[PDB]
């Protein structure tokens, strides 16, 4: 009546609560793995950053960002979208490679000359080297990544275990090594063609590092967002409990008048 309609909606809230509980639990298990991977990646990459630093640097233009194909995990997807957008104030038509289905849809609106290359099937998978390598190799061929003066990579940095701030680092072009302040303490002749090779190899290694942070940030956000969902859903359970209790009394009292009027007559 009113009654059954109360009871079913309270159920709906319950089922929702039950699934967000389930999720947070599965999120905690994934998360541990995620953060451990990210130390190793950062540390490996860091050994290259040491070079890039000492060497110094002089880093259209490309944008990469890394996100989940699967929807829901917090505001990971659209806070990441604000930061892409910030750097698309340089050139409005600049070419975005979307590792992640979600961000692509949103960007395609804001400017349509952005989506050029896109990937798929990353979101259900971990930050593993194979994915990064193939995409890097394809980035050279399709998109001609070695032409660019700037390459920039976006991810969401897992700031503290309860937060994520969208963050960046620049993949350094082959061009940087050559003309940078010091290449005299990284002297060469014809012993190797270090730029064209060192560049390729750091496309995949820096991009991987970015996937690892992003993954750790996403799974962390997800846990927190679902954690908050249970709370807000609980609050509705408790209000709807007052609704159920009033709904039950009303049905019984209105019903009594009916039997009484009949009996009198």
């Amino acid at each position: 009546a009113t009654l059954k309609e109360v009871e079913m909606r309270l159920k709906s809230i319950k089922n929702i609560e039950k699934i967000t509980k389930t999720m947070k639990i599965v999120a905690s298990t994934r998360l541990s793995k995620a953060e451990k991977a990210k130390i190793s990646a950062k540390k490996m990459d860091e050994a290259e950053q040491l070079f890039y630093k000492n060497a110094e640097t002089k880093n259209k233009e490309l944008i990469v960002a890394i996100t989940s194909d699967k929807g829901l995990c917090g505001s990971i997807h659209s806070q990441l979208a604000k930061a892409v957008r910030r750097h698309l104030n340089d050139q409005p038509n600049a070419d975005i490679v979307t590792i992640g289905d979600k961000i692509k849809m949103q960007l395609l609106r804001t400017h349509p000359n952005n989506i050029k290359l896109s990937i798929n099937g990353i979101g259900k998978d971990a930050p593993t080297f194979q994915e990064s390598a193939l995409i890097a190799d394809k980035l050279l061929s399709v998109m001609k990544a070695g032409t660019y003066p700037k390459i920039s990579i976006f991810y969401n940095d897992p700031v503290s275990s309860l937060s994520f701030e969208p963050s960046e680092k620049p993949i350094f072009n082959a061009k940087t090594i050559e003309q940078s302040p010091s290449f005299g303490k990284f002297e060469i002749d014809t012993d190797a063609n270090v730029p064209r090779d060192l560049f390729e190899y750091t496309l995949a290694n820096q991009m991987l590092t970015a996937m690892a942070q992003g993954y750790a940030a996403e799974i962390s956000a997800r846990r927190n967002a679902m954690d908050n969902a249970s709370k807000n859903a609980g609050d509705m359970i408790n209000r709807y409990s007052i609704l159920y209790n009033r709904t039950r009394q009303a049905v019984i009292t209105n019903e009594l008048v009916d039997i009484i009027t009949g009996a009198s007559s």
């Binding site: 593993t128 390598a133 995409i135 190799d137 290694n205």
Partner: protein, 48 residues
């Protein structure tokens, strides 16, 4: 092909001796697509 795609293959051979864990195989084996794109317009996906 790239210098780092050749390292990648070298890494692939290395994933199989049998002693190696599940994650190792994933750093060396993925079945995915990559959505080809141009313009809005899309050529259809192909396996990465």
């Amino acid at each position: 092909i790239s210098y780092a795609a050749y390292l990648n293959v070298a890494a692939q051979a290395i994933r199989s001796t049998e002693l190696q864990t599940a994650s190792v195989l994933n750093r060396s084996q993925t079945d995915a697509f990559y959505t080809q794109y141009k313009n809005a317009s899309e050529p259809t996906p192909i396996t990465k």
